[PDB]
Design a binder for this molecule. Structure first.
Ligand code: CFM
Ligand code: CFM
Ligand code: CLF
Ligand SMILES: [Cl-]
Ligand SMILES: [Cl-]
Ligand SMILES: [Mg+2]
Ligand SMILES: [Mg+2]
Ligand SMILES: [Mg+2]
Lengths: 478, 519, 519, 478
C-alpha cells in the first residue's frame, strides 16, 4: 500500500489490542485499507455478521429496518406497532421521511398506532387484541387505504399468528391488511428488516393490481429505495420529470399503497438505496421483466452521470432532454462551486452510516474538493463494500460495524476535519472538537439529493466546518 | 431551483412554484380522496360525536404518552459514578434508548446491549451475558455494570442473578466490578417503573448485607425518580447546602448529562459514589421525591434500611417546597435558612405581580403521574383551573387522590382526570373542552397544529414542560422544583398568556386597539 | 353584551357584532380618509422611497430609543445603601421616572421631588431645596439623599452646590446625612450619561478627601453603569466569589429592586455601603464594565483614585467573559476557578449543539451603546449577521469602533451601523433590509406589528433583550452577562428561530411537511 | 362625628406627628372626616395647593394633564412633545386611551413625536427647529388632520414663541396647528394642564366650523371627559345609541379633531370627567347655549340614574327607551350581583386616584356590597370634594394630595381589605399584603363603564381580593 495505507494498518492493530482475544481476531476481519487495483473485496473484509456483545454498536434491529425504514413512510396506510409500547414510541417521527397530506385524516405517518401489550397479552396472546384493534382503527381512521402490522420482539416468541388476523380483517374491512414478522431479535441489524419487508411487499402488495388496466407511457419509471429524507425524493423526481419521464411510483418516501400497486406496470425501476430495495427490484426484473439500474443523485458529477445513464435506456428524445437539464442547472452548479469549494477544499472527512450513504455521498464531497480518509458502514453486506471500492483513494480505512470505542479511537488518531455520522455519534465528537454533520437526518436540513440539494449540502458543510465556535474549545488561559 | 445568494432549505424550497406543480402532478397518481371528503373527515374528528367513539376504544392505542421500562433503568443507572448501563436482550432497544435521550439532552449517552438474537429463545442468553460483560469491561472500563432487560429476555425468562454469578466465577468479568441487575419488562407499567426497579437493584447490590443504623450519619438521602431537568438535581443540592444539612442524591446524572465541550469526551462524570450508596442506610432518613413511582424504593428504605421514609410530595410549587423544607428541618433539627425565606418571598412577590393574567385561565396537561399531580397542585395555588388532566401511565389510586385534591379546591370544580388514555384522547378533549393552553412534551405540537387547523379561534397553544422536549433547545437545563423552579413555571405561564394575547391583538387596524405597550 | 359564564375583557369584547357596528357607525362622523387612501399611504411607508425621505430628517424625532439623564441618576442612586433619590426640580419628572421603573421591574421605586413651580422659576429653587431636604429627612429617614436635577432647574441655572451648602448651614438637613449631587441636564446625552454623572457625585462626596493607596485592600471594585437586569449584578458577585477575589459593586440596586412580598414594605435594602464606597480608593483597581458610558467614572478612577482603570469590554458573550476573567486573574494574582472553566465549556457545548439554527441568521438590534456593542460582538462569535445595528444615544467615536469590529469579521460584511437615529428610522430599515429577527425592547413590538401588516412573509419578530421590557413579566430577573448570561442569550436566540419555524410550518396539509418533531 | 370619625381624626393626628411643624400644620388642612349632613366642605378641607417639597407626592405636571390626558388621545392629530426627549418617552403609550385606526398612517397616538432639544436649542431656542419639524412631519405623515405642540419645561423658560410658529405653519400646511403652553412647572399638578388644554380648544379648535352646514338630529349629544380607558367610552356610547341618541362626538377617548369641531352643533353635553372638562362645557353653555350635565356610568345603580336623567332631557320616546334599555340588562346585572356580591360583601376599600374616580366608583363598589373607609384625590378641587360628600358613610377619612408616607400609614392603620390606586402605589401595598387594583389603568383590564364593564369590574375585584396568593405572605413555619 502507500504511506497512508501503512499508517492505517498500524492504526488498526493499535485499536484492536484492547479487545479480548476472541473478539479481537474477529474484529480484525471487519477492517481493511483500500487498493485502487482491486475490483471486489474478496477476503479482505467480512460484513453482515452478528454484532460483538457489549461493545456499544450503532446498529438497530429488524423492526427498525421494516417499520422504521420501509413501511413507515407510506403515508396512506396506518402502520401498527404490535407489541409493548416502547418500540413505536422511540421511532415515532424520528426519521424525516417527508410527506404531504392531512395528518390523522388521509395520512398517518406521524401517528404511533400500537397494541400496547400488557402482561395479559403476553400470557394469553395478542391476536384477539389485534383483531379488535383493527376494527377500532377502521371506525376512527376511515380514510386509510391499507393497514400494516409491524411485529415487535414478543409477538413471534409467545406464538401469535398475525397472518390469520390480517387475512380475516382484510376481508372484513375489504382493504389490504399486511402482516410483517419483523421481530427485532431476527437478523443482526436493520438489514434483515429490509429483506423481510420487501418479501412482504412481494406477496401482499405487489400483485394486487395484476391483470388490471393502466394507461402506460413509454417513459414510465419508479424511484425505488428513496425515503425522501428532508424532501430528497422530491428534489430527485423534479429532474426526472424535467427530463421527460413520468414517475409512476416512489418507494417509499411520500409513497402510497396505490403507487406501489402500480409499480409492476413501469418500464424501468430506478434504485437509489441498493441495500434496502435491491430484493424487490430483482424480483420485478424476474417476474415482470422490468429492468432496473442503480443511480446516484448526490453532487453534480454523479447527477450528470445518472441522468445520462437513465436517459440512455430510452431514446434520442430523452437523451437530448438529459443534456438540456444538465445545461439548465450548470450556472447554479458553477456558482455553488465558486462560492463553497474554496472554503472546503483540502479538508478531510470520516463517514460512518448505515448501508448506502457512506459511499453514495463521496462524489458530492469530492466535487467540493474534500477528501474521504475513512469510510464505514453499520450493516452493509460485501456487495456494498465492493461498490465502495471505485470511489476511495489508495490506503483509505474501510470498516464495518464499529463500536463506539473503535470510532472514537479512529477519530483521535486520524484527526478528520469533519465527520458525517448519526445522532448517537454527534454529541461525542463535538465534545472532542470535531465538526460534525448528521448524515442520516441531514441535521434537520436538506434535501441533499439533486441540483437543489447540492446547494444546501455545500452551505451546510461550510456552515459547520468553518463555524467560529470551533476555535473556542480551549479557554484562552489554557 | 436555487439562487446562490439565498439558498433555501426544504422549507421553504418546496413552497416554490416548480414543486407545487410537482405535487399537483404526483397527486393524480396516488388515487387521493377528494379534498372535500378529507376536510369533511377532518371536521368530524374534531366533534363530540367522534370523541364518544374515540373514548370507546379498548384495544387500539394512538400516540401514547409513556415509554417502556428499560428507558427508565438506563436513566437511573447513568446517575451512578463510573457506571455503564447494560441492557441484556436485543440491540434494537439500546439504539432507541440512546437516540431518545440524545435528542432530549443534546448529549452523548453510553449504553450497551449484549445483542441477543434468535439463538437465545432456545438457548437462553447466558453466552451473550458472559461475552457482553467481558467486552464491555475491556472497552469501557466501568466500575459498575448496571444490568436491565429488554422484553425478549423477559419473555425468555433469563435468570440474571445466575448468569452474573456464572460470569464472575468463570472469569468473564472481574469480581471487583459491581453488577447490579433488575428485571425491567416493557409490558408492565412504564419508564418510571423501570427507574424504580433499577434503583431497587442498586440498593440490593450495595446494601443487602449491611448492619445499618439510621442517624449514625446526620445526613438525608434524596431520591428523585425519573427526572429529566438538570436544574432539579442542582436546586436540591443548593437548598440542602443552604439548610446546612448534609445530603446525598442517590442517582444523580446531572454531571454526566452536562459535560463540557473542551476537546475531550468523558464517558463518566460525577454521579452517586459507591460510598454514598453503601452508607445510605446510616442516614437519618431517605426522602422519596416522586412518591407515586418510587414504590419499590419505599420498600427498600423502610424494610431494608429501617428508615421512616417520611412522606413528601414532589417539591413543585410554593406549598410543596415549604413542606419539603419543614420536613428537612424537622428531621435534621436545623432551622430554615434566611436566604431560603428570602427566595420564598420573591416567589410570592412574582405570583402577586402576575396573578391577574393567570387567574381563571384553563389548562389541559399530561405527563407522568408525579409530575402531573405536582403541576396540578401548583396551578390550583395560582388560581388557574386544570380542566383536563391526563396521565397515560397513572393508576386508579393516583386518580382517586387527584379527584380528592381537585374536589377540595375552589379551582378544581370543572376538572376532569383521565388515566390510561393517550394523546389521541387528549386531542379530542382539546377540541371539546378547549382550555386556554396545554402543558405537555413535544408530542403536543401535533395537537396544537390540529386545533389551529379548525380555526385561529380554536387553537390551543402548547407550553413545553415535561419529557421529551425535542423541538426546542436547552430546556432540559431548566429547573421546575423548589422556589427557583416555581419562579420558572410562573414566568413561563404568564409570558405564554402575554405572548398569545399579543399575537391575537397584533392585527394592524383590527385587533390592535388592545395591543398594549404595558402588561 | 356579556354572559354570566363567559365575561370578556376589552379584547375580545370589542370584536363582538354590536361593537363592530358601533365602530362602523362612528366612522361616518370622524370624516375618515377612505380605506383605499389609508392603504396606499401604509404601503408607501414600507418602501425605499419613503425610507429615503425618512433619513432626510434633521429636526423631527419619532419614537426615540433613549430617555433623559435624571432617570439614569435615580437608578445609580438606588444602588447605594439607605439612599433616597431626590430630583431637584419639577415634580412631573419624578412621577414619570417612578412609573417607568415601576412598569419594568414591577417593584416600588422611591424617589422624591422638591416640587419647583412658577414661583421657583423667578426666585430659583433654594427654598424648595431647603424645605425638600427637611421634609424628605423627616418622613423617610435616609442616611444619604442623592440629588440630581430636572431640565427646569438646569435652564434657570440653580446653583445646586450652593443650595445644599445653605441647607446644611441653616439646619434644614442634619450633618449625619450625606448629600451627593450631580447636574443631570436632560438636553445633554441620555439616561446613561445621568448615571455616570451621579456616580461621579458619589465618588466626590465619599472619597474626595481620602488619601488612598491602590492595593491596600486586595479587592476589585466593579462599576456596572445603567443596568436593568437583576441577574447581572448577581452573576458578577457570584463569579468573583468563585475566583476568591474580594470585590464591591459600586452601585448595586439588585436587593432594593427585589425585596420579598412578606407583609412588610422595605424602602431600603442592600446596596453599596458607605464603607464600600469610602474604601474604594484602596482597591487594586476598579473595572468599568460599560466603558462607553462610564466616562466621568474613568476619570475618578484614574485621576482621583490613581488606579489603573484596566480596560475591559462589557462581559457579554464567550470572549468578553474570558477577557473579564483573565483581567481579574492577572490583577488579583489568583487562578480562574475550575467551576468557571466547567461553566465555560457548558456554554461552548450549547453553542455547538445550536450552531446550525443560528448560522447566517440576520438580526437588527437597537439599545444603549455598550449593550449594542457587546451583543453585536457576541452575534459575530455565533456566526450570525447583525445587519442593522442602531443606537440612538451613541456617538461618532463609538460608531468608528463598531465599524472597525464589523470590518474585522466575515459576518460583519453586510452590517450597517446607525447613530442619532430612532425607531421610526429602524422601522424603515426592517422593511428595506428585512433581517430575520430584531432584538430590542418593548417599543419594538410596534415595528413587528407594522411588518406583519405588509404580510406574513415580511414579519420581523421581536426578541426582547434590553430596557425597558414592559409587556412581558419578570424578564428583569434574567442574566445576560458572563457565561450564565451567554447561555440565556443563546437559548433565547435559538428558541426564537425554532418557534418561528414551527409557526411557519404548522399549516395542516400545506407547510407541515416540515413540522418536524425533532429539531 | 361617630366613633369611626373619631378614630380617623385621632389617626390623622398620629400620622402627621412625623412632619416638620410648618408642613404639619399645612397638611392638617388637607384631611377631614365626612358628615352625611354636610352639603359643602367649606373651610373643612383645602385643595389644589402646591405640594410640600420632598414628601413623595403622587402628583404629575401640567404637561401630563395636557398632552397625556386631554390631547394625547385624539387619534387623527399628531402631538409634538416640544422640548428634551424625556417627557414624551415616559408618557408614550402608558395610558390606555383606546382607539381604532392604522397607527402611523391615519392615527398617531402611540407614536412619540418630539423635537429632542439638545443644548444648542436651549442656547438659541427651538422655534426654527419646530418650524422645520412641522415641515418634515407633513411630508412623512400626510394623513394627519391637525397637529398640536405640547410645551415641556424648557420652552417657556427660554423665551420661545410657539404661537407664531403655529400660525405660520398652519397657513403653510392648511391644517390646524395648535400651540399649548403646558410647561410642567406651571400649576401644582395635572389639573392646570387640563384647564390650559380646555382654553386652547376654546380658542384654536372649537370655532373652526362656525356657520358651516351640519345635518343635525334632535337627539344629538357629545360625550365630554371620557378618555376610553380600556374601551370605557365605547361601552358608554353603545348604551346612549341603544336609548335612541346620536353621539356626534366623544372627548377625547378615540376622539378626532373633526368631532370636536362638530361639537358646537349638538343638543346636549354629557360630562363624565367634571374635573378635566367642566371648563369647556361651561364655555359651550355660555357661547353656544348647549346645556350640559354630569353623569356616571359606573355600576348598575349609577347607570340607571344617569340613563333616566339624560333621557329626561329629551321626550317620552327617549324616556321610554331608557326604561327599556335598563330592563333589558336587568337579568345580566342580577346574575352578576348574585355571583360576586357574596364573595365581596362587607369588605372594606381605600381609594386614592386623581380627580374623578375616587367618588365616581363608589356606587359600583356598593352594588357589590363593599364599603369605602377612605377616599382621597391627588389633585381634585374643593368642588370635587363637595361632589364626594353625598356618597360617603359617616366618619369616612377624606383627604387630598397624600404623600407616600401618609398613604402607607393610613393603610397600616385602617387595614382595608382592598386598595384602589395607581401604578406608583401598587407594588408597595402588594408587599404589605393588601390586595390592590390599579384603578387608573384598570390593571390592563376593563372596560369598567356601562353594563358590559360592570361584569368585568365584578370579576376583577373578586379575582384580586380572593386570590389564593394573599394567604401565603407568611411562611408556614412562622
Ligand atoms: S442508516 Fe441508508 S441503507 Fe437505510 S435510516 Fe442510513 S445509510 Fe438507514 S439510504 Fe436509508 S434513509 Fe437511512 S440514513 Fe438505505 S434505507 S436503514 Mo439512517
Ligand atoms: S389620575 Fe381622573 S381626573 Fe384625570 S389619567 Fe385619573 S381619576 Fe388622571 S377621570 Fe381621567 S382617565 Fe385618568 S385615571 Fe378625569 S381625566 S388626570 Mo389617571
Ligand atoms: S429489538 Fe421495544 S424498546 Fe425494546 S424493551 Fe421491548 S418495548 Fe421497549 Fe427492536 S422490535 Fe422493539 S426496538 Fe427492541 S423491543 Fe425488539
Ligand atoms: Cl401512579
Ligand atoms: Cl457612545
Ligand atoms: Mg450538548
Ligand atoms: Mg415585584
Ligand atoms: Mg379608523
Amino acid at each position: 500500500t502507500n504511506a497512508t495505507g501503512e499508517r492505517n494498518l498500524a492504526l488498526i492493530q493499535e485499536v484492536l489490542e484492547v479487545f479480548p482475544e476472541t473478539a479481537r481476531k474477529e474484529r480484525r476481519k471487519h477492517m481493511m485499507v483500500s487498493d485502487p487495483k482491486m475490483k471486489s473485496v474478496g477476503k479482505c473484509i467480512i460484513s453482515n455478521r452478528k454484532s460483538q456483545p457489549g461493545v456499544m454498536t450503532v446498529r438497530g434491529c429488524a423492526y427498525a429496518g421494516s417499520k422504521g425504514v420501509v413501511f413507515g413512510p407510506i403515508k396512506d396506510m396506518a402502520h401498527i406497532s404490535h407489541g409493548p409500547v416502547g418500540c413505536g414510541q422511540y421511532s415515532r417521527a424520528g426519521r424525516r421521511n417527508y410527506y404531504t397530506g392531512v395528518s390523522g385524516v388521509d395520512s398517518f405517518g406521524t401517528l404511533n398506532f400500537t397494541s400496547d401489550f400488557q402482561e395479559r397479552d403476553i400470557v394469553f396472546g395478542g391476536d384477539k387484541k389485534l383483531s379488535k384493534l383493527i376494527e377500532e382503527m377502521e371506525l376512527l381512521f376511515p380514510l386509510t387505504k391499507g393497514i400494516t402490522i409491524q411485529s415487535e420482539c414478543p409477538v413471534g416468541l409467545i406464538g401469535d399468528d398475525i397472518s390469520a388476523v390480517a387475512n380475516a380483517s382484510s376481508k372484513a374491512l375489504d382493504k389490504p391488511v399486511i402482516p410483517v414478522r419483523c421481530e427485532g431479535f431476527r437478523g443482526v441489524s436493520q438489514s434483515l428488516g429490509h429483506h423481510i419487508a420487501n418479501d412482504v411487499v412481494r406477496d401482499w402488495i405487489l400483485n394486487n393490481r395484476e391483470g388490471q388496466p393502466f394507461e402506460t407511457t413509454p417513459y414510465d419509471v419508479a424511484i425505488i429505495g428513496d425515503y425522501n429524507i428532508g424532501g430528497d425524493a422530491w428534489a430527485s423526481r423534479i429532474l426526472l420529470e424535467e427530463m421527460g419521464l413520468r414517475v409512476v411510483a416512489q418507494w417509499s418516501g411520500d409513497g402510497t399503497l396505490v403507487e406501489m400497486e402500480n409499480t409492476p406496470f413501469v418500464k424501468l425501476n430506478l434504485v437509489h438505496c441498493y441495500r434496502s430495495m435491491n430484493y424487490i427490484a430483482r424480483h420485478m426484473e424476474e417476474k415482470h421483466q422490468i429492468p432496473w439500474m442503480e443511480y446516484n443523485f448526490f453532487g453534480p458529477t454523479k447527477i450528470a452521470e445518472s441522468l445520462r445513464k437513465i436517459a440512455d435506456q430510452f431514446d434520442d428524445t430523452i437523451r437530448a432532454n438529459a443534456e438540456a437539464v444538465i445545461a439548465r442547472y450548470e450556472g447554479q452548479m458553477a456558482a455553488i462551486i465558486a462560492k463553497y469549494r474554496p472554503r472546503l477544499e483540502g479538508r478531510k472527512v470520516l463517514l460512518y452510516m448505515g448501508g448506502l450513504r457512506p459511499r453514495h455521498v463521496i462524489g458530492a464531497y469530492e466535487d467540493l474538493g474534500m477528501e474521504i480518509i475513512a469510510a464505514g458502514y453499520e450493516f452493509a453486506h460485501n456487495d456494498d463494500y465492493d461498490r465502495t471500492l471505485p470511489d476511495l483513494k489508495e490506503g483509505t480505512l474501510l470498516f464495518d460495524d464499529a463500536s463506539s470505542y473503535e470510532l472514537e479511537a479512529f477519530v483521535k488518531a486520524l484527526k478528520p476535519d469533519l465527520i458525517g455520522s448519526g445522532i448517537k455519534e454527534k454529541y461525542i465528537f463535538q465534545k472532542m472538537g470535531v465538526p460534525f454533520r448528521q448524515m442520516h437526518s441531514w441535521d434537520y436540513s436538506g434535501p441533499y439529493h439533486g441540483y437543489d440539494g447540492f446547494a444546501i449540502f455545500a452551505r451546510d458543510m461550510d456552515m459547520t466546518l468553518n463555524n467560529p465556535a470551533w476555535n473556542e474549545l480551549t479557554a484562552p488561559w489554557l | 431551483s436555487q439562487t446562490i445568494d439565498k439558498i433555501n432549505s426544504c422549507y421553504p424550497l418546496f413552497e416554490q412554484d416548480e414543486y407545487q406543480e410537482l405535487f399537483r402532478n404526483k397527486r393524480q397518481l396516488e388515487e387521493a380522496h377528494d379534498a372535500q371528503r378529507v376536510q369533511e373527515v377532518f371536521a368530524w374528528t374534531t366533534t363530540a360525536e367522534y370523541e364518544a367513539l374515540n373514548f370507546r376504544r379498548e384495544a387500539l392505542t394512538v400516540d401514547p404518552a409513556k415509554a417502556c421500562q428499560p428507558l427508565g433503568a438506563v436513566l437511573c443507572s447513568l446517575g451512578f459514578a463510573n457506571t455503564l448501563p447494560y441492557v441484556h436482550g436485543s440491540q434494537g432497544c439500546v439504539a432507541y434508548f440512546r437516540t431518545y435521550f440524545n435528542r432530549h439532552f443534546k448529549e452523548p449517552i453510553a449504553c450497551v446491549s449484549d445483542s441477543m438474537t434468535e439463538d437465545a429463545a432456545v438457548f437462553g442468553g447466558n453466552n451473550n451475558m458472559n461475552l457482553g460483560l467481558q467486552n464491555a469491561s475491556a472497552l469501557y472500563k466501568p466500575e459498575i455494570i448496571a444490568v436491565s432487560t429488554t422484553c425478549m429476555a423477559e419473555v425468555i425468562g433469563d435468570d440474571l442473578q445466575a448468569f452474573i454469578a456464572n460470569a464472575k466465577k468463570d472469569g468473564f468479568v472481574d469480581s471487583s466490578i459491581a453488577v447490579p441487575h433488575a428485571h425491567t419488562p416493557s409490558f408492565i407499567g412504564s419508564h418510571v417503573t423501570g427507574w424504580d426497579n433499577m434503583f431497587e437493584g442498586f440498593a440490593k447490590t450495595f446494601t443487602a448485607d449491611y448492619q445499618g443504623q439510621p442517624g449514625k450519619l446526620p445526613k438525608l438521602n434524596l431520591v428523585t425518580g425519573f427526572e429529566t431537568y438538570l436544574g432539579n438535581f442542582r436546586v436540591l443540592k443548593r437548598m440542602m447546602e443552604q439548610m446546612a444539612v448534609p445530603c446525598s442524591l442517590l442517582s444523580d446524572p446531572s454531571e454526566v448529562l452536562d459535560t463540557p465541550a473542551d476537546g475531550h469526551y468523558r464517558m463518566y462524570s460525577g454521579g452517586t459514589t459507591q460510598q454514598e450508596m453503601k452508607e445510605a442506610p446510616d442516614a437519618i432518613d431517605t426522602l422519596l421525591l416522586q412518591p407515586w413511582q418510587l414504590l419499590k424504593s419505599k420498600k427498600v428504605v423502610q424494610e431494608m434500611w429501617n428508615q421512616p421514609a417520611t412522606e413528601v410530595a414532589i417539591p413543585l410549587g410554593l406549598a410543596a417546597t415549604d413542606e419539603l423544607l419543614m420536613t428537612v428541618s424537622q428531621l435534621s433539627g436545623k432551622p430554615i435558612a434566611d436566604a431560603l425565606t428570602l427566595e420564598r418571598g420573591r416567589l410570592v412577590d412574582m405570583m402577586l405581580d402576575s396573578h391577574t393574567w393567570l387567574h381563571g385561565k384553563k389548562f389541559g396537561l399530561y405527563g407522568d403521574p408525579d409530575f402531573v399531580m405536582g403541576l396540578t397542585r401548583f396551578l390550583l395555588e395560582l388560581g388557574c383551573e386544570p380542566t383536563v388532566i391526563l396521565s397515560h401511565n397513572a393508576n386508579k389510586r393516583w386518580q382517586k387522590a387527584m379527584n380528592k385534591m381537585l374536589d377540595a379546591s375552589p379551582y378544581g370544580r370543572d376538572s376532569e382526570v383521565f388515566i390510561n388514555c393517550d394523546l389521541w384522547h387528549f386531542r379530542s378533549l382539546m377540541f371539546t373542552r378547549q382550555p386556554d393552553f396545554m402543558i405537555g412534551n413535544s408530542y403536543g405540537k401535533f395537537i396544537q397544529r390540529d386545533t389551529l387547523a379548525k380555526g385561529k379561534a380554536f387553537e390551543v397553544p402548547l407550553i413545553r414542560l415535561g419529557f421529551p422536549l425535542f423541538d426546542r433547545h436547552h430546556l432540559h437545563r431548566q429547573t421546575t422544583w423548589g422556589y427557583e423552579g416555581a419562579m420558572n413555571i410562573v414566568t413561563t405561564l404568564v409570558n405564554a398568556v402575554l405572548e398569545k394575547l399579543d399575537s391575537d391583538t397584533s392585527q394592524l387596524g383590527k385587533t390592535d386597539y388592545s395591543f398594549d405597550l404595558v402588561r
